[PDB]
């Protein structure tokens, strides 16, 4: 008797969210399907699930056009992760796909050959188009910030792929450091661009704000480890997640390693909340306050989407 | 009869520079030796060569303390590149070393284990200490900017390491895209921090300024391919550089592939100069003008250090 479909992980600290606006969900679903099919030929598609995800994560988006900025980038990240993630060879594939986000600058001879490569597969078409919309809408600081969060993500994938090539199981803290980079982070950190305002770059760069962002990404990324745990038991080979690493390294039974992972998640989510409360008091400028709230909304919305997806993918029977 | 020791690559576009201030060289040499030996135990050391390098590249540094910011980071990058760069496994080593530059944020349990890892080897001690000095001196925007340039560098190393694991020879444009990231870039882009002023983040993020920075890094990085070419013929196995890739892909004789590489360098260095002249006219704010000049100085100084090092490492006999 594993928990009831639609129920949250027992013991996981989280915040309920409202039903996502069904009119916006349907509209995002139609436009993303058409972008996928007609603009970037993403396949030779679940628009509805990505719609719910993005509307739930960005309740402050002024329009569906703002929602679409985040939606195309999220679908494009999924095209890379499913189409590129043998990990041998990964570092070359990802660097070329990264040039769709952070452009190559070269001679009159070599530039057009790179430009042609941007049409060459689903992942680079997805990125090049999705980034194109984002760069027209956001400020240059917002675009640079996203490119850095994507470089972090790609470094994260490549640590994970390197350990996979040797079946290495890292220490728990090492897994968690990899998962700080291989992480949802580039999705909530665009909450200002999606919300139609700007967190100024000098405030984004403060060390306290960097710690807030990191804790939130780390917590909401361990949510994915906990909800997708059962599905990864069947995975082609051994895929790492926080419960599996704790069990292997701290030699614990699965159930206890899982329950400890829930407790790790909770402490990260509580520290994210305390850090954001402290910075809201230290620096109560409106864009700071809005950005903190929009990261918390993205985090709560990401939890709800995982939860509402337990209708597809069960929780383990540990309670 | 290969060119005379101390002479530049024939046909390479470059700018002469003054002798580096010998008093500053000697002082940087003593302080870096002592940092290497007493603060970070970098080995169980050529202070003079790194001194000349940094003084020649940063003629505007107000003090030796400012020079030292760049010097410790450069020596720390060299400790990673020589101590970590089998490429299997690289993506895990580099991500953990990256956490010395972009800190891990985690639970009260796992944080101190990571903190201990920062003492564990020369490369992470070098980074953690060097970044520590830089973060105290620079603005938070300057520190974030350096972390992004280091994430680029690490992505670049990992593309190169992935192609090395299969002996892949990329197309020329693909090599040049990898070398845009695996690149000197994080050294000239700290020229403002070293110069004791700040290029504001919103101006750094402009697309035209990003193209200027990229072209300069690309040109001055191909300078390293051209000067170190002969030494890489003897390398343990086949190391890629622009002449070797052009020869292999464009099936050319070595000499002609080399001469074409010189011409690629020239066009990149000319376009960097035109792009910087255009932005100096479009946006003649003093920190912009100073930053453009300081990137050009770093580029000229990097060329001179390579040239003055032909006393150690010969040019090929192609002229």
CATH label of the domain that carries residue A308 = 1.10.600.10
| Sequence-ordered list of residues with C-beta below 8 angstroms from that of A47, at least 6 positions apart, any chain | A28, A29, A30, A32, A33, A36
Residues of A within 8 A of B218 (CB-CB) are 105-106
Q: How many CB atoms lie within 10 A of CB A7?
A: 11
Q: Is A225 marked within a binding site?
A: no
Looking at the complex, report in whole angstroms how far the Cα of residue A47 sits from the nearest Cα belonging to chain B: 32
Is B148 in contact with A144 (CB distance < 8 Å)? yes
Check the annotation: does B224 bind a ligand. yes
Write a three-state SS string for chain B. CCCCCCCCCCCCCCCCCCCCCHHHHHHHHHHHHHHHHHHCCCCCCCHHHHHHHHHHHCCCCCCHHHHHHHHHHHHHHHHHHHHCCCCCCHHHHHHHHHCCCCCCCCCCCHHHHHHHHCCCCHHHHHHHHHHHHHHHHCCHHHHHHHHHHHHHHHHHHHHHHHHHHCCCCCCHHHHHHHHHHCCCCCCHHHHHHHHCCCCCHHHHCCHHHHHHHHHHHHHHHHHHHHHHHHHHHHCCCCCCCHHHHHHHHCCCCHHHHHHHHHHHHHHHHHHHHHHHHHHHHHCCCHHHHHHHHHHHHHHHHHHHHHHHHHHCCCCCCCC
Resolution in A: 1.8
Cβ distance B215 to A163 less than 8 Å, yes or no, reads no
Residue B6: how many other CB atoms lie within 10 Å? 10
Two structure tokens written together for A59 = 């309740």
CA-CA distance, B109 to B112, in Å (whole number)? 7
Contact B257, B246 (CB under 8 A): yes
Any idea what DSSP says for residue A212?
H
Q: How is residue B276 written in tokens?
A: 């910087």
Between CA A165 and CA A176 the distance in angstroms is: 19
Question: Does B187 lie at the interface with A, CB-CB under 8 angstroms?
Answer: no
Element (H, E) at A295: helix A286-308
Q: Which member of B117, B205, B268 has the closest CB to residue A201?
A: B205
Q: Which of residues 24-43 of A touch B (CB under 8 A)?
A: none
Q: How many residues does the structure list for chain B? A: 319
* CB contact B242 to A (< 8 Å): no
What's the rounded Cα separation, in Å, for the pair A155 and A180? 10
As a dihedral over the C-alpha atoms of residue B89, residue A239, residue B155, residue A139, rounded to 10 degrees, the angle is: -160
Q: Which long-range contacts (CB under 8 A, 24 or more apart) does B169-173 make?
A: B169/B240, B169/B245, B169/B248, B169/B249, B170/A92, B170/B240, B170/B245, B170/B249, B171/A113, B171/B249, B172/A110, B172/B242, B172/B245, B172/B246, B172/B249, B172/B250, B173/A104, B173/A106, B173/A110, B173/A111, B173/A113, B173/A114, B173/A117
* CA dist., res. A265 & res. A226, Å (int): 9
Q: Does B141 touch chain A (CB under 8 A)?
A: yes
Cβ proximity of B176 and A95 under 8 Å: no
DSSP secondary structure string, A75-138? HHHHHHHHHT---TTHHHHHHHHHTTTS-----TTHHHHHHHHTTSSHHHHHHHHHHHHHHHHS
Separation of CA B226 from chain center? 15
d(CA B89, CA B82) in angstroms, rounded, equals: 15
B173 in contact with chain A, both atoms CB, cutoff 8 A: yes
Asked whether residue A106 is marked as a ligand-binding residue, the answer is no
Q: Cβ separation of A144 and B108 shorter than 8 Å?
A: no
Cβ contact (<8 Å) for A162 and B91? yes
CA gap B125, B103 in Å, rounded: 14
Q: Which residue of A has its CA nearest to B110?
A: A173
What is A238-255 written as a DSSP string?
Answer: ----HHHHHHHHTT--HH
Q: List CB contacts (< 8 A) between B107 and chain A.
A: 264, 267-268, 271
Contacts of B312 (CB under 8 A, 6+ apart): none
Q: Is A237 helix (H, G, I), strand (E, B) or coil?
A: coil
Given CA atoms A11, A15, A21, A24 in this order, what sign does their dihedral have?
Answer: negative
Q: What is the Cα–Cα distance from B317 to B125, expressed in whole angstroms?
A: 41
Q: Which residues of A touch B141 (CB under 8 A)?
A: 201-202, 205
Buried b / exposed e over B90-101, threshold 16 CB at 10 Å, is bbbbbbbbbbbb
Give Cα separations from B237 to A104, A134, A162, B86, B229 (angstroms): 28, 43, 22, 12, 14
Contact B125, B119 (CB under 8 A): yes
Domain that holds residue B225: 1-319
Does the beta-carbon distance from A155 to B88 stay under 8 Å? Answer: no
- The C-alpha atoms of residue A148 and residue A142 are separated, in whole angstroms, by 10
**For residue A131, what are the contacts with CB-CB under 8 A and spacing of at least 6?**
A73, A76, A100, A101, A143, A146
Burial class (CB in 10 A: 0-12, 13-18, 19+), B267: middle
Helices B172-181 & B242-249, crossing angle to 10 degrees? 160
d(CA A293, CA A283): 14
Reduced DSSP (H G I as helix, E B as strand, rest coil) percent helix, strand, coil of chain A, to 5: 70, 0, 30
* Smallest Cα distance from B184 to chain A, Å: 15
Taken as a whole, chain A contains a residue count of 319
Say yes or no: A217 contacts chain B, CB-CB below 8 A: no
Which residues, 6 or more positions from B267, have their beta carbon under 8 angstroms from its beta carbon?
Answer: A107, A108
Cβ within 8 Å, pair B177-A107: no
Is A228 annotated as a binding-site member?
A: yes
Extract the tokens encoding B287. 């920190």
**Nearest in space to A202 (alpha carbons), one of A141, A293, A272:** A141
Q: How far apart are CA A263 and CA A244, in angstroms?
A: 15
**A121 Cβ under 8 Å from any chain B Cβ:** no
Residue A135: its chain B contacts at CB < 8 A?
207
Q: Number of helices (H) and strands (E) in chain A: give both, helices first.
A: 14, 0
- Does A274 reach chain B within 8 Å, measured CB to CB? no
Contact between B179 and B221 (Cβ < 8 Å): yes
Cβ contact A79:A100 at 8 Å: no
> Cβ–Cβ of B107/A174 closer than 8 Å?
no
A162 → closest Cβ in B89, B139, B173: B89
> Cβ B173–A144 below 8 Å, yes or no?
no
Considering only CB atoms, B95 lies closest to which of A147, A177, A205, namely A177
CA distance linking residue B79 with residue B101, whole number of Å:
14
* Paired tokens of B198: 């700040």
Beta-carbon pairs below 8 A across chains A and B: 202
The verdict on a CB contact (< 8 Å) between A95 and B178 is: yes
- Please list, in sequence order, all residues whose beta carbon lies within 8 angstroms of the beta carbon of residue B44, skipping any fewer than 6 positions away: none
Cβ pair A205:B144 closer than 8 A: yes
Token duo for residue B308: 């003055």
Q: Do B91 and A155 touch (CB under 8 A)?
A: yes
Residue A81 in marked binding region: yes
Interchain pair B110, A201: CB under 8 A: no
Domain total for chain B?
1
Using only the alpha carbons of chain A, give its radius of gyration: 19
- Cβ–Cβ under 8 Å, residues B84 and B158: no
- B211 close contact with A: CB closer than 8 A: yes
Contacts of B248 (CB under 8 A, 6+ apart): B169
- The half-sphere exposure of B134 on its side-chain side, counting CA atoms within 13 A, is 33
Give the CA-trace dihedral at A215, A218, A220, A226, to 10 degrees: -140
C-alpha span between B205 and A1 (Å, rounded): 54
Q: Are residues A294 and A60 in contact, defined by beta-carbon separation less than 8 angstroms?
A: yes
Q: Report the C-alpha gap between B66 and B82 in whole angstroms.
A: 25
């Amino acid at each position: 008797a594993p928990p009831a479909a639609g129920r949250a992980v027992p013991g996981l600290y989280h915040h309920p969210v409202p039903e996502p606006d069904p009119v916006r969900v349907e509209e995002v679903s139609r436009r993303i399907k058409r972008w996928a099919e007609d603009e970037v030929q993403l396949y030779p598609f679940d628009g509805f699930s990505v719609g719910r995800y993005m509307v739930g994560c960005h309740p402050d988006a002024p329009t569906v056009d703002h929602l679409m900025l985040a939606t195309r980038l999220m679908v494009a990240e999924n095209a890379v992760d499913d189409c590129y993630c043998s990990p041998v060879g990964l570092g070359g594939r990802l660097l070329l796909a990264h040039t769709a986000i952070d452009h190559f600058h070269s001679t009159a001879e070599y530039t057009p050959t790179w430009q042609a490569s941007l049409a060459a597969d689903a992942p680079r078409r997805a990125y090049d188009s999705a980034m194109g919309y984002f760069v027209r809408a956001a400020t240059p600081s917002q675009s640079d910030r996203y490119r850095h969060d994507m470089a972090r993500l790609h470094l994260g994938y490549l640590a994970e792929g390197a350990w996979a090539q040797t079946g290495h199981v890292p220490e728990v803290w090492e897994y968690l450091a990899m998962r700080q980079f291989n992480n949802f982070r580039p999705c909530p950190t665009i909450t200002d661009t999606v919300g139609g305002y700007e967190l100024p770059a000098d405030l984004h760069a403060r060390p306290d704000m960097q710690r807030v962002i990191a804790l939130a990404g780390n917590a909401t990324t361990i949510v994915n480890d906990l909800y997708s745990y059962t599905k990864e038991l069947n995975s082609p080979g051994r895929h790492l997640n926080l419960p599996v690493v704790i069990a292997e390294r701290e030699q614990l039974c699965e159930r206890d390693a899982y329950l400890k992972a829930v407790e790790v998640h909770n402490e990260l989510q509580h520290s994210f909340e305390a850090a954001a409360a402290d910075l809201a008091e230290a620096c109560p400028l409106p864009p700071v306050l809005r950005f903190l709230r929009g990261v918390a909304a993205w985090v709560d919305g990401n939890h709800d989407w995982h939860r509402t997806n337990t209708y597809r993918y069960s929780l383990p029977d540990f309670w």
